[PDB]
């Protein structure tokens, strides 16, 4: 049962930096994992950032992203930068276990980030 877990609520930094830990529970043990962070704004979903990483290696956002991340085993600690008040909202942690089979999709219940300054 691919289940994803993330905090209920997080305050952004004064400099618009919010971090949250999201780690998953895997029936197997997978080596190639893809993490995506989504914003759920009522009706729509938007892709905040993604990254693929190998089990044991460095989490690396070769995007260019506003996301940096560190990976401890079954865990990711994500940090999002450049947030502004209009960015307050619910952020879904999406994890794909991709290798070895079988494929697993886990979608978290969401993290509410409040950006005020």
């Amino acid at each position: 049962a691919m289940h994803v877990a993330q905090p209920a609520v997080v305050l952004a930094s004064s400099r618009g930096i919010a971090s949250f830990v999201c780690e998953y529970a895997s029936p197997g043990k997978a080596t190639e994992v893809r993490v995506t962070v989504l914003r759920q704004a009522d009706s729509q979903v938007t892709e905040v950032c993604a990254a693929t990483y190998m089990m044991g290696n460095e989490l690396t956002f070769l995007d260019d992203s506003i996301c940096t991340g560190t990976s401890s085993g079954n865990q990711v600690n994500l940090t999002i930068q450049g947030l502004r008040a209009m960015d307050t909202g619910l952020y879904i942690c999406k994890v794909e276990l991709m290798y070895p089979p079988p494929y697993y999709l886990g979608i978290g219940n969401g993290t509410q980030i409040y950006v005020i300054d």
Epitope: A1, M2, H3, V4, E32, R34, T36, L38, V45, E47, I92, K94, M98, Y99, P101, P102, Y103, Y104, L105, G106, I107
Partner: antibody
């Protein structure tokens, strides 16, 4: 407007190959995973194959493992299904479908008919 | 492979009635990573419900999803003529993606 338009359907003799193509318009193809799903005449849906974003992760149904190949040209915004060693039971409407960012198959092509028969 | 068993095979109801469709899973399903598709003859399937209970865009309110674990139910609160069609449930959280065999909702006369 999201749109998937499939082509390549036709008749094939058993043991041979056929390649379906699915042409995607209306969204940034490279941010979504894609599937093929078939429906034999008179029956329900059967998931055929899955391909990740960059194309470097592919999964197949047991009924076609070792015979079919899925692939994508992100530059041409096109999805392909390479079918080999075709059997009669592979005869179906073959749908191309897009994975929603939250998991389900939210947009579907129109389906193309593939008849495998001597 | 998570096998989805839909029931009944056919629903014989008259327009305006409430239709209740069921989908049971061979094992526990994801976290309600279950979806419902509609299909009329000669058309592709179209997503109705995802995440067990959330409506796809443009899907009217009469369609509603409930359930959890291994027991899921799609409800149509009042059947309009366009709702008579085939309905598939689908587990999409783990490979292989699997579908139920479908319930057909036909006009009782």
């Amino acid at each position: 407007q999201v749109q998937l338009v499939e082509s390549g359907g036709g008749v094939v003799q058993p043991g041979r190959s056929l390649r379906l193509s699915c042409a995607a318009s209306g969204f940034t193809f490279s941010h979504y995973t894609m599937h093929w799903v078939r429906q034999a005449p008179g029956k329900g849906l059967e998931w055929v194959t899955f391909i990740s974003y960059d194309g470097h992760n592919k999964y197949y149904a047991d009924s076609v493992k070792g015979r079919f190949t899925i692939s994508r040209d992100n530059s041409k915004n096109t999805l392909y299904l390479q079918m080999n060693s075709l059997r009669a039971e592979d005869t179906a409407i073959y749908y191309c479908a897009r994975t929603g960012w939250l998991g389900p198959f939210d947009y579907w092509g129109q389906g193309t008919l593939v008849t495998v028969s001597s | 492979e998570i096998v989805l068993t839909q029931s009944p095979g056919t629903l014989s109801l008259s327009p305006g009635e409430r239709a209740t469709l069921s989908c049971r899973a061979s094992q526990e399903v994801g976290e309600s990573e279950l979806a419902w598709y509609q299909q009329k003859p000669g058309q592709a399937p179209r997503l109705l419900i995802y995440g067990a209970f959330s409506r796809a865009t443009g899907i009217p309110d009469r369609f509603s999803g409930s359930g959890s674990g291994t027991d899921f139910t799609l409800t149509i609160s009042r059947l309009e003529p366009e709702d008579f069609a085939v309905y598939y449930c689908q587990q999409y959280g783990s490979s292989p993606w699997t579908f139920g065999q479908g319930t057909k909702v036909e006009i009782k006369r």
